[PDB]
A paper describes a structure:
Peptides between 37 and 43 residues in length are generated, with those of 40 (Aβ40) and 42 (Aβ42) residues in length being the most abundant. Here, we determined the structures of nine ex vivo Aβ fibrils from six different mouse models by cryogenic-electron microscopy.
The residues V12–A42 form the ordered core of all three murine type II fibrils. Each monomeric subunit is stabilized by two hydrophobic clusters around residues L17, V18, F20, V24, N27, I31 and L34, and residues A30, I32, M35, V40 and A42. The interface between the two protofilaments is rather small, involving only two symmetric hydrogen bonds between K28 and A42 of the opposing subunit. Strong, localized densities can be observed close to K16 in murine type III, DI1, DI2, DI3 and murine type II Aβ fibrils. For example, when the APP23 line was used to assess treatment with the murine parent antibody of aducanumab, a reduction of total plaque area and improvement in spatial memory was seen. However, given our new knowledge of structural differences in Aβ fibrils, the preclinical testing of this treatment might have been more predictive for efficacy in FAD.
Author numbering:
A (entry chain B), B (entry chain D), C (entry chain F), D (entry chain H), E (entry chain J), F (entry chain A), ...: 12 to 42
């Protein structure tokens, strides 16, 4: 197992008001 | 197991008002 | 197990008003 | 287990008004 | 277990008005 | 003409990440 | 013309991360 | 014309990280 | 024209990290 | 024209880390 760059943003992100998660094992994510 | 660069931002981020998490084991994330 | 660069910002970040977390084991994150 | 550079900022950060955490074991983070 | 450079700032930080924490074991962080 | 309580919140508001406007005369509101 | 209590919050507000405006005459509001 | 209490908070506000404006004549508000 | 109590806080404010403005004539407010 | 109590805090303010402005004529406010 070899995880790498799970979430990738090649260009700029204007703003973040939610949740950006690379890897989760649990749950209960509310956006 | 070898985790690396789980969340990647190649360019600038304007602002962050939520949650940026690379790896989580629990839960209950509210955005 | 070998964690490295879980959250990566290649360019500048304008501002942070939320939560930037590399790794968590618990939960209850409110953004 | 070998943690390293959990949160990385390659360029300048304009300002921080939230929480920047490398690793947490508990919870109850309010942003 | 070998922790190192949990939070890394490669370039200058304009200002800090929140919380920058390398490692925590408890909780109740309010930003 | 008598404007009063254009937007009313009788109970608590968990959070606001958009725009709450009582009265507008122009336009171009982006949510 | 008599404006009064254009935006009303009868109970507590947990947090504000957007824009709360009572009255506007222009525009270009980005949330 | 008689403006009064354009934005009203009857109870406590936990925190403010956006913009609270009573009256504006221009524009270009970014939240 | 008679402006009064444009922004009102009847109870305590936990903290302010954005902008609280009673009246503006220009623009370019960034939160 | 008669301005009075443009921004009102009836109870205690825990802390201020942004900008509290009663009246502005220009612009370019960054929070």
């Amino acid at each position: 197992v070899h995880h790498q760059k799970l979430v990738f943003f090649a260009e700029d992100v204007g703003s973040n008001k939610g949740a950006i998660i690379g890897l989760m094992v649990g749950g209960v994510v509310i956006a």
